[PDB]
């Protein structure tokens, strides 16, 4: 499977930008684009040898971990650190089999009894996304936390918190140019801060926005979708047009009409 590297050590807006662009390049194939917005591969009929991509993260502490992302949804399904690999609890039998194809060389593979969805991760971490700071420092720290989990140095809450950080700075950033933009800002001024309502609502609405766009009438939504601006005020989305500079890729929801 393809591998994309990134390091928090000396990270700049440009190195982060190159990273995200590279990830998107490996996620999509250019075969499916609706209203100028790329669509991820359809899970149905997708060969297993084209199912995942790897993201190898390194930090100033000279530690490295490798996350595994499902190309059909950019979902982080697990990670490897040295001689151990951990996978979130699969949603179905098909996904449980698919993951057996990842890190086939690791001496110890473990599957968590819990899922990797925010609801569960926030419960384990004992904090919501709105209260978990994001930025290069948090990522640098998160990479160390994941790395030391097998040895017992990392507590469950801290592991969950760390996943929440990696997922947003990698998966959500790849999905939304807007979120990638918020992370670039944090890196540029080396300032850490929790995600505002605009970020949170976008993360929560990806599936619905993907469906609305794909089932739209020439781009026009049948029903509007409400998002939130940074100050928390409501923002109504009625068309795919206003989302072009915001959403980088969508999950496949339906076939494109003639
Ligand atoms: N594990 C995960 N990977 C990607 N996006 C997610 N959103 C919530 N959990 C996620």
Numbering used by the authors: 6 to 263
Manuscript text:
Ricin toxin is a potent ribosome-inactivating protein derived from the castor bean and a relatively common bioterrorism agent. The heterodimeric toxin consists of a lectin B-chain linked by a disulfide bond to a catalytic A-chain (RTA). Free RTA inside the cell can irreversibly inactivate ribosomes by cleaving the glysosidic bond of a specific adenine base in the sarcin/ricin domain of 28S ribosomal RNA. RTA has a single tryptophan, residue 211, located at the active site pocket.
The electron densities of the ring and Cα-Cβ-Cγ bonds were clear throughout refinement, indicating re-orientation of the side-chain to the relatively common t80° rotamer. In this position, the hydroxyl group of Tyr80 can hydrogen bond with the amide nitrogen of Gly121. Upon examination of a crystal complex of RTA with adenine formed by soaking with adenine instead of AMP, we found that the overlap of the tyrosine 80 ring with the purine was much less than previously reported, due to a difference in side-chain rotameric position. The RTA-urea and RTA-adenine complexes also showed similar fluorescence spectra and a splayed arrangement of Arg180, while the positions of Tyr80 in these complexes differed. Watanabe et al. found that binding of adenine to the RTA depurination site as monitored by fluorescence had a KD of 1 mM, in agreement with our figure of 0.7 ± 0.05 mM.
